[PDB]
């Protein structure tokens, strides 16, 4: 009774142990069979109790599982936990049946990686069951054909006569036989999202999580087990990516016997879910990627998968527009005149899209009011949104709009009319973040209002771009429309409502490129990527700061989704003075755009913009859709370097960065990756080099002084 | 507005911040005043919401707290969490009043460190309260005068008119300003408890815990923050020790701003506690220790505190008897004839105590029955317990007895008469560990039965020693005598019952030396130490294996409570063959005893035991009550070394161990600690050396081959 | 140090094998094993002395030591494993092999048939064993 | 005459030097190593085989220092103390992957296996007869083969 999933060049093996227990066997490089799946020492482990008292060698505490529970002889953290009406939390899932079908199913009300054809993947559903309480849990396994991708999710269903309160419902849980690994997660904060942190495993519990009702800047919903000697180019890597934009738990547990339990899903903390007889619960999926070619190998798998089989819309395989954003340029202080006046210059520079940011609606001359009142400010925009987009479109420029539909200002017409439409709890002070409150997306009336309001605003003007922002984390989580026994479902219901809101709006407006945002990369997760094919990576627009941020973001998320804008100096977040050349090279290593006041730019800088915009247009397809290789990590020293390679390896773009200048420095060298060794490459403005030479020998770098420098070379085969 | 606790040579500083928020300030080497407690930058941290909408510089997500909560502008792991009847988990504790009184209070139904005089310590009780729900929480702080010890615990009380469910109630929580620390905890298993694990802190969550209803072999209730360069002899160390013997959580959380939140208490997982209007809840205490003298400085503080102000009874300050246990010798196969037969030789060897282990009651020929039926098996002991004890005393030996009152075998008269007295949940298979079930000590009838039955047994014979054992971990945790809304209180109510049971039994029998046990050091925690002054360290009685175990154990617990027996070879746990000299030297480094078959020994071996016993008696006071220094760690190399120093530093005992011998080895050297540098010492059997010479230069060790060697020297001042 | 004759044999078979001890002081049991040791090494002498050598576990990095000898055509293999200090209640041990044809299944003498790709990518569970200074040696033959 | 030999089936480069005095005066070789090579970078670890009698050739992995590191023998024999072999390995190189550069001396007497890292991050690896306590005299017409 053995299940075998073949995903790309990888294998995921499961087994039915004894009387209907689902046991984990193997995950790694693909094998034909695991003959020694049951050929392991059956040991009597002291203080590991037995479901069958007669056999001391069997214990759920010492069994590698796929969906473990606590209570019946397992003392490790469970994948799920259900509390009965009698108060007990003991459950017992046994194998009932299974089914295998080509393709990949949709998740109910949740984002998920998909397929366009049946042959692209195969799905294994393992139906477990607890007969005493009628609890049915279906484990959804999907294996992609071309990629090393295994996705996992669980669907609960109450087929009993009693009420079941889910205390914990993680998306997956896998027990590794050994624990001699490091682990990489992506901690951070606002202005510095997703720093790569590598740590050795401890004997106990390690976890990255979010209690902020969002994926957050503090911890990105992604963890990975790496081999001790694994680097960017080689070694075994196991990735764990959560397709969900709310609260999450990403945990690794090492027990007494050197096994490592990796579990991931909706954070159990402050979370419950009542299941009446007949009701069901669907968990979001976790994308699990294996690679024996280091972090680059893993990331590239994620890059292709998320860009072609997660992101949607007409702009999925489309080159993204080079836009100009007015946020850092003017903030709230702007008008229709100043925007139209500068639009002439922008079109001459090669800019393709003008994006009107926060401050167009209500009385938004600051960030303390007007949220929820999505009506055009006539004092600032006399001709309205349609009039502005009109004057912009005739100059060959596209128009874009900024919205934060999940938020409501206390000082707004919406909050005066609907004070109960926000997240709150009875008789408690309503705490504010950036002087605003969170709308109750758990409610059907609130969601329907937003869906109708926003859809009309975006259709009231020839708009082809929308920036969806959110600048607050949930506090006083609760809903008036929910009974006391369902109050802890509020956070997830909010995220479900949000997913419902975005799905309907984006459907009504297919001609609109949506870009998710949240004080920068506060929601840079696979969930948001499903609804909006790109994200504002970080509010930190500093060239040097972006080195770490974009490097870490690229570990999981594709470049096509990684928004990067050239800003002004001294930087508004750090005060650093870097050359326009290096700012461009950094931003051209992502989804390229601008965000600065052109009126304050010198004629030399204005000229460099024209050159930059023209340059990125020649490499836009290469940067956004090509294979991405990281070379030098800014987390490991004074340098940063990466490169983009085409599918046929005929073209390539290389970027190099050095932050702090060294007097009388040693000669610098750079070794490349992903090029065809059996072919020569011309490095534009540097000469012809061998493909084998650039990878095995490397290339001498120009000697340069000055802080914060950058180099870009276009590589073409001969 | 600043609370200042002065514990020994250390300071613990707190302050009231704004509208009655209790904030942490400083903990480390003693200072007169922290004048810069408020002189820190007030920043607007993005996505960190504000209790005061006008002031973005204030947030509970950025405040160093003493007992933080989740829900109102704090996104880090809370010290507690309460669910109201309306379903909300938002609470808001503010300052009310505080009291300061000499001495130290007892904790209701809980073990705690104590004082014999008011002058020995002061106690600060800060009263916090949530006006809306009528919740009063009293934070209990106690600072000792001579030791660097701050103890913390909390007391809840529902003064409102509604029910309150404590989802989480940790004993303490503290926010360090920085997070540049390593952390040490004590993971392990049966036969290898408390291995010292040093790990760097991760940005996120690291934790050591227990979900087994016992402090467990797997994770000892102790974590510590140490400086990056702190070792055994120098550097800042922050110890956290849980005075509790059940489920626990010991967590460290590093946030986005590099602050470290250390929290410890009853494990929130699978735990709730309902508080009816008028009801209360007292948490166990956490003993917090600071030292700048490294790990030795921390341990020695714990040693004096736990030995003299936690352990109780008439044997607290008394030298512990050199006993002999028969468990490894005969196991279950013994009789009255065999015991008094060998007891003649045991008396002549100098042994002071004969301990009768498992197998004396009911029909214990196996570990499959009789647990619960605590009557003497007349088949094995025809003259009963009274008869066997008298034949022992007449040979000049004390008599001891083994019990496991917390358990019940399905095959027993107790279970057939009371099958609902065990821990169980409705309609679920009753899992067995070592073919036994756990008794429901949450019930008054069960406890009352045990208190009466055990007291009568131990009074039916001249017994002066008791080995209290437990060989299973709780599964299917539930009580038939509890309402469904209190089922998750079972695990803690069990521990309360056990404490009550142990407290009354040891009170009826003040003349009996009680030693706790749990398949070894399964519950070697401060909680158990309060009721029983010593503990069986590990079932692993291998001299080399005991090096790591006893080394790790001494980090927190005093040598006086660290049981160590000399066993036979090849060892029963690892099959290792070490010399009797070595096994003696390892065991004499703790509470010395024997546990092997004497009849199977040779003539030259019995003469060594006679010398070992005599030698230990001469240094028993020094070993059990002297100052302990770790010199060489078996976790860091092939060697292990430590020493005992008298209070006036005039007498010392040095132990050295070398596991694997290397051919043509470099010369070995050993530097000592805690000696008077201004005084010479005579190493017995080596010569006269200077105190400064032994500490600063060291002593050249004699070269010798073979594996598993040991050296022991007595040091006397001239 | 006192180590068993079996492990002493297994270590010496991992090189140019020979003997250097007083045979007259050996017990009957020890001389029997010695005869089997000589016969066994003769079967794998060409493999050990002229085959491809792979190191698996380093005794400079941990409590273990492991290596294997692979023939030129990768149809034969001799795997040796060593564990020095025994730990009580030890975690399960595993050993991943190297230098085998992943497309072929291999027969481990005594145990059974394992996949070449399995032996390299997944590894094989080792028997739990007590006592210090233990050794295990398996002959591998392509199916 | 610098002698270089490259094998076909193996990644083996062998090196040796041959001195010859074709002048009128006599020359004194104070040092005559078999080879020397300057690596452009020096971000490597190095492995040598130190030991003693009864424990020869233990593996020792160490990071490179900016300066001089060397294994050598002054015992008139290759010795148990230091085996005539050193290697430059990549920082992430192990038993199964990574770039390694082995240097093996085909000589049984005194040796010097030295790695020097200069002010500009270059690594000079040289190996040959130990210069210490060693000289060689070349009269006009005489030769010395390393
Ligand atoms: O308030 C507007 C501001 N919010 C945060 C976003 O990330 C910025 O780009 C900008 O849109
Ligand atoms: O079964 C008895 C056994 N239980 C476990 C203890 O640790 C042993 O010493 C012995 O008392």
From Swiss-Prot, chain D:
UniProt GO BP: protein homotetramerization; raffinose catabolic process; stachyose metabolic process
Gene Ontology molecular function: any one: alpha-galactosidase activity
Keywords: Carbohydrate metabolism, Glycosidase, Hydrolase
Annotated positions binding substrate: 53
Applied value in biotechnology: Has properties that make it suitable for elimination of D-raffinose from low green syrup in sugar manufacturing process from beets in order to improve the yield of sucrose.
Domain of life: Bacteria
Subunit structure: Homotetramer.
Function comment: Hydrolyzes the short-chain alpha-galactosaccharides raffinose and stachyose.
Family assignment from sequence similarity: Belongs to the glycosyl hydrolase 36 family.
Protein name: Alpha-galactosidase AgaA
Taxonomic source organism: Geobacillus stearothermophilus
Gene designation per UniProt: agaA
Positions spanned in the full protein: 147 to 292 of 729
């Amino acid at each position: 009774k053995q299940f075998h999933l073949r995903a790309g060049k990888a294998s995921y093996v499961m087994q039915l142990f004894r009387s209907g227990y689902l046991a984990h066997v193997y995950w790694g490089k693909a094998v034909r069979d695991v003959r020694g799946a049951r050929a392991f020492p059956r040991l009597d482990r002291a203080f590991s109790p037995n479901p069958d008292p007669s056999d001391r060698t069997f214990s759920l505490d010492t069994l590698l599982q796929e969906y473990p529970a606590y209570g019946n002889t397992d003392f490790r953290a469970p994948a799920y936990q259900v509390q009965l009406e009698n108060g007990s939390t003991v459950t017992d899932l046994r194998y009932k049946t299974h089914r295998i079908y080509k393709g990949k199913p949709r998740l109910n009300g949740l984002p998920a990686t998909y397929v366009e054809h049946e042959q692209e993947a195969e799905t294994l559903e393992i139906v477990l069951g607890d007969a005493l309480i009628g609890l049915e849990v279906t484990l959804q396994y999907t294996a992609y054909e071309k990629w090393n991708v295994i996705t996992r999710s669980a669907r609960f269903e109450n087929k009993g006569g009693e009420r079941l309160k889910l205390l914990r419902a993680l998306s997956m849980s896998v027990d590794f036989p050994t624990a001699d690994y490091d682990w990489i997660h992506l901690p951070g904060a606002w202005g510095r999202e997703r720093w790569i942190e590598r740590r050795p495993l401890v004997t106990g519990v390690q976890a990255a999580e979010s209690r902020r009702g969002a994926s957050s800047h503090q911890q990105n919903p992604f963890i990975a087990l790496v081999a001790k000697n694994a680097d960017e180019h080689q070694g075994e890597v196991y990735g764990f990516s959560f397709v969900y934009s709310g609260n999450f738990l990403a945990q690794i547990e090492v027990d007494q016997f050197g096994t490592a339990r990796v579990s991931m899903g909706i954070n159990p903390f402050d979370f419950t879910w009542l299941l009446q007889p007949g009701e069901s619960f669907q968990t979001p999926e976790v994308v699990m990627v294996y690679s024996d070619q280091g972090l680059n190998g893993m990331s590239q798998t994620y890059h292709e998968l998320y860009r072609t089989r997660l992101a949607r819309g007409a702009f999925r395989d489309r080159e993204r527009p080079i836009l100009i954003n007015n946020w850092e340029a003017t903030y709230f202080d702007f008008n229709e005149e100043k925007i139209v006046n500068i639009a002439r210059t922008e079109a001459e520079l090669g800019i393709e899209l003008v994006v009107l940011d926060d401050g167009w609606f209500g009385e938004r001359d600051d960030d303390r009011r007007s949220l929820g009142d999505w009506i055009v400010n006539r004092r600032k925009l006399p001709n309205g949104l349609d009039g502005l987009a009109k004057q912009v479109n005739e100059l060959g420029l596209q128009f874009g709009l900024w919205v934060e539909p999940e938020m409501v200002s206390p000082n707004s017409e919406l909050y005066r009319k609907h004070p109960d439409w926000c997240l709150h709890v009875p008789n408690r002070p309503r705490s504010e973040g950036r002087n605003q409150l969170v709308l109750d997306y758990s409610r059907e009336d609130v969601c329907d209002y937003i869906i109708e309001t926003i859809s009309n605003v975006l259709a009231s003007a020839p708009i082809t771009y929308v920036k969806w922002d959110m600048n607050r984390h949930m506090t006083e989580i609760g809903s008036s429309a929910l009974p006391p026994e369902r109050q802890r479902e509020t956070a997830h219901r909010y995220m479900l409502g949000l997913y419902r809101v975005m799905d309907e709006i984006t459907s009504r407006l297919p001609h609109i490129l949506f870009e998710s945002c949240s004080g920068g990369g506060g929601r840079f997760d696979p969930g948001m990527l499903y609804y909006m094919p790109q994200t504002w990576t970080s509010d930190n627009t500093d060239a040097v700061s972006r080195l770490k941020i974009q490097y870490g973001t690229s570990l999981v998320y594709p470049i096509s989704a990684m928004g990067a804008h050239v800003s002004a100096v001294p930087n508004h977040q750090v005060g650093r003075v870097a050359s326009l050349k290096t700012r461009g090279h950094v931003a051209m290593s992502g989804n390229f755009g601008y965000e600065l006041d052109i009126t304050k730019l010198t004629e030399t800088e204005k000229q460099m913009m024209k050159q930059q915009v023209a340059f990125y247009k020649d490499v836009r397809r290469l940067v956004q859709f090509g294979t991405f290789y990281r070379l030098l990590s800014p987390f490991e020293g004074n340098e940063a370097a990466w490169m983009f390679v085409s599918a046929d390896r005929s073209e390539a773009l290389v970027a190099y960065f050095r932050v702090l200048a060294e007097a009388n420095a040693p000669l610098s060298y750079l070794r490349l990756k992903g090029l065809d060794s059996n072919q020569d490459y011309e490095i534009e403005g540097l000469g012809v080099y061998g493909g084998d030479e650039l990878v095995y020998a490397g290339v001498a770098l120009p000697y340069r002084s000055s802080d914060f420098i950058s180099m870009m070379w276009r590589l073409k085969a001969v």
